[PDB]
Amino acid sequence: GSHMSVLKLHVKVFRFETNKDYNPAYESYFLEYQEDQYLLDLLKQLKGVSYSENIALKINQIAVFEDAKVSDLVAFFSKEWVLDPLSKRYALKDLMIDEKAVLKNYEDFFKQVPYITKGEKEELEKFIQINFINPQTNPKYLGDGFFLYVKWLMKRYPTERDRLLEMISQPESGVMNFLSVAHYLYKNDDNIDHEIYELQEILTNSKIKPWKDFSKNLLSLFQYHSNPPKTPNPPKTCALFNAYAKHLDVQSLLKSAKLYLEKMGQKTIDLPFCYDGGYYGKIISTHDFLTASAYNLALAKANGVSLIFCEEDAYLNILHAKEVLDNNPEIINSVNEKLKKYQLVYEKDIEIVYLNEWVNEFLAWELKSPFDAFVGAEFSRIKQSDHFFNKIHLKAPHFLESFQNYAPLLEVNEASGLLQCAHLRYLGIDLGADFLIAHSLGLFYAFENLSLKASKIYKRDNDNTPTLFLPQIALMAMGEKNKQDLGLDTHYHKVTFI
């Protein structure tokens, strides 16, 4: 035989100059690398291509800020790379951006802060690249680099801290618009996320309108059952988390969840779970958020039932609560003081169930209605359902934007939440999907109930592609044909293929 040269890349490189008249084009390079090499070594092979040696660019639309080993980048990105600047809009040449053009957006801001030094003004240049990690598309959005720069100035000018904060507080443009960008940053780094969550907590706890009232109203929604039940239950008894904001339509989710569980040999009971604060509760008041979560977990355990998290929003919340409680015994003591009045006692490591994990994991059932005729587009902040979809023969292509979810914005900047969820919806449709799969109740609501209101403002023809939850799909694949039993009669977009 012969040696197989396996260390090979296909790199497509954005070629463009903002001051020249040729359209952007991608050029293909077929490069060899060695196990020892770093990104800068590959960039050095790209003749005529403009890039900074201080790494700041995108590979497959994920922001990369380090000179990483090529082998590590291949593990993360595959051997097929698209190399882009951090921003096409502000591209200067090839892989470099026009920092000067970006900075022009902040001229009005700087006129409001004439007291800062020339040096302090110039420091924003060191932050600005951070703006381009965020995949969000609101053009009024001030930029995450800019938010962190203002944070830097707030430290340096304690007197102006509240005035500075107010400048990044506007509903249309400010920091309340931020949502996790970790998926779109190389190595899923959450440092930026935590820095901005910190600002959101500061703002929601400040006197600035409308955030003071936003927080007071949200905290008034933690409503605990005074005397919750504690009864023993037989094996295989479940209770579904059901404490969601009152406007959310949860009927089909909870109905299909129950039916799926029953099909899987479980029985369900109702328990008065406390509201968890939705998306923002954990930002506004960690301690209230933790107390509600501890109450819910203690309540499930006191009744000897599995607590079923039927969708992503509540499950991600409970993961966060468990991470904090189960690693900090002092916080458990603190929450347990508040739980005494309900005669509940939280203990670490209370086992819970994510329904969508069960759908993917437990596959020992007969396929009665294959999905081979169909294409799905699945949105999840966690993971695509490869195994379950393979089981049922559903083709569900992976796509860049599947990890995004702008439903929380419905509470803080409704117009932007509406537009960006509508954008995600049509990205799914444009993949050729017969239906969308929502892991998130919030996103489902945006896709469905708010579809009509969104169409009136999102400038694209009406499409009636339905959205389904995983348990609904599973039930259908198991041969369920009764639309009402699946909860589908209450969706906005009707299912027509059964």
Mind giving me the DSSP string for 102-152?
A: HHGGGHHHHHH-TTS-HHHHHGGGGTGGGGGT-----TT---HHHHHHHHH
How would CATH label the architecture of 211-362?
A: Up-down Bundle (1.20)
- CA 473, chain centre distance (Å): 22
Q: Which of helix, strand or coil describes residue 195?
A: helix
Cα–Cα distance between 72 and 83 in angstroms, integer?
16
Strands 306-309 vs 352-354: parallel, antiparallel or unpaired: parallel
Domain boundaries, the chain: 1-97, 98-210, 211-362, 363-498
Rounding to the nearest 10 degrees, give the CA dihedral for residues 174, 176, 182, 185: -10
Handedness of CA 81, 422, 469, 248 (dihedral sign): positive
Beta strand segments in 186-275, E: 237-240, 267-269
Residue 417 tokens, joined: 């939440």
- In terms of Cα–Cα distance, which of 458, 379, 377 is closest to 416? 458
Fold of 1-97: Ubiquitin-like (UB roll) (3.10.20)
Reported structure resolution in angstroms: 1.9
Helix 251-263 and helix 470-477: axis angle, to 10°? 40
Fold of 363-498: Rossmann fold (3.40.50)
How would CATH label the architecture of 98-210?
A: Orthogonal Bundle (1.10)
> Phi-psi category of 466—alpha, beta or left, where left has phi over 0 and alpha has psi -120 to 50?
beta
The per-residue DSSP string of 70-101 comes to: HHHHHHHH-SEEEEE-S-STTEEETTEE-HHH
The per-residue DSSP string of 322-351 comes to: HHHHTT-HHHHHHHHHHHGGGT----S---
Cα–Cα distance between 374 and 379 in angstroms, integer?
16
Helix/strand/coil (H/E/C) assignment for every residue in 372-412: CCCEEEEECCCCCCHHHHHHHCCECCCCHHHHCCCHHHHHC
Beta strand segments in 237-340, E: 237-240, 267-269, 306-309
Strands 91-93 vs 96-97: parallel, antiparallel or unpaired: antiparallel
The DSSP secondary-structure symbol of 414 reads: H
Q: Which of helix, strand or coil describes residue 289?
A: helix
C-alpha distance across the termini of the chain, in Å: 55
Cα–Cα distance between 241 and 307 in angstroms, integer?
7
